[PDB]
Amino acid sequence: MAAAAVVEFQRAQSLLSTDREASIDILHSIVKRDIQENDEEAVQVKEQSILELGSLLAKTGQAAELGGLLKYVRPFLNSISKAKAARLVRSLLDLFLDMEAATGQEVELCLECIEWAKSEKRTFLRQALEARLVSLYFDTKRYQEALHLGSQLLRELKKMDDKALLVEVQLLESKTYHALSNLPKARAALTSARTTANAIYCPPKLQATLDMQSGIIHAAEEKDWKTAYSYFYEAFEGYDSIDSPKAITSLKYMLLCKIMLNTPEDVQALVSGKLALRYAGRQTEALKCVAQASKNRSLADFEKALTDYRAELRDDPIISTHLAKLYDNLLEQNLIRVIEPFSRVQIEHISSLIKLSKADVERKLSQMILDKKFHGILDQGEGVLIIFDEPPVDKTYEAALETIQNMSKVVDSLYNKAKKLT
């Protein structure tokens, strides 16, 4: 049939050369073909056919018509009805992630798939699809939908099976958990994933995912920077080959560990050539500008980098969370130095020293009183910040308070037995 010749090949070319209009008539021949008719010989033609379809899809130039074509991948997979169908899937998943065929159509196609997978084919094929579904939902920021699906799979089997592909679902689940800011459920999941990983048995794409997740948990959450970074270096090198969007993230993350550690030396070295230049985008400069801002002790420099760079910063949920934690800490460190005399320091003198703007400082201080992240009070009626000085003993009141509460419990017991007298 078609696998990289005739109808499918003609379509590939048609997207690239002409227009989308041209591709439509062609695609109808390919959908029809996939349904029960397939290349059943595992002597080249077959792996090429699913693959060639994966290249048309994730070509991309995406539009609704192409989404419809994506829905067909599943009958093409069903028709094969062999062991070889599973290997084909694993290979296929990366093309989709780098470049979507369309976000809305793909999530739905995957949810359908899982049912089919559990039944007819092997758990090797089942594990692989779930990793696509979970990654897909995560970018959509339906953080719950992704976790719910992944967890459904784990729950059905773990009785004696682990596999490299099964770990990958769990790596992607950890990533979703890191973005919410929850380490426990992620840490439990990390363990199972690293254990099968120790002995390599995987293509470069799985290795990089295992390295990147181990790194996010170790960097921000557990707080060992040496441990986080080391995994990131491997993750980049693995990511760069098969992937595009993934590789971008991993390089920024490399810079991120070292920014928190607050050494400039490492950040600068990492920015520079390992394979870094190609994936290095506008965000290398966001990460670089924030490092200088922490170092220098300027809060103002930081706010600015966030605003300008924001779309890219926001898109990967993990990055945003990390950047946010970095922001709350910077803000607290810088304040302590200016405030320190106590008394009635004017909001304006501190503002100048701190390296902040007038509008920004007022707001930051306002949040802080409530949080009690400096233990002062802000006076908006006079336009001064007062910091609470040490007062005379609270101790006297507290000991009285404690004694009187214990006696009140006792009184309640004391009365009941007394009832007997009268």
Binding site: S151, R155, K159, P184, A188
Partner: protein, 50 residues
């Protein structure tokens, strides 16, 4: 001892999770971990056989 070990091991994973109770996901993982380790220690005709 192996069955005692599966129940106990399950409870340990659930704490990590931030739970106070086991789930299915932990219970099944425990079974695997105790039995494979036993089969690894006990066998030694398996080197590239069965």
């Amino acid at each position: 001892a192996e069955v005692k070990g599966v129940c106990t091991e399950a409870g340990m994973y659930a704490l990590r999770e931030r739970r106070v109770h086991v789930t299915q996901e932990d219970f099944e993982m425990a079974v695997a971990k105790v039995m494979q380790k036993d089969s690894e220690k006990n066998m030694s005709i398996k080197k590239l056989w069965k």
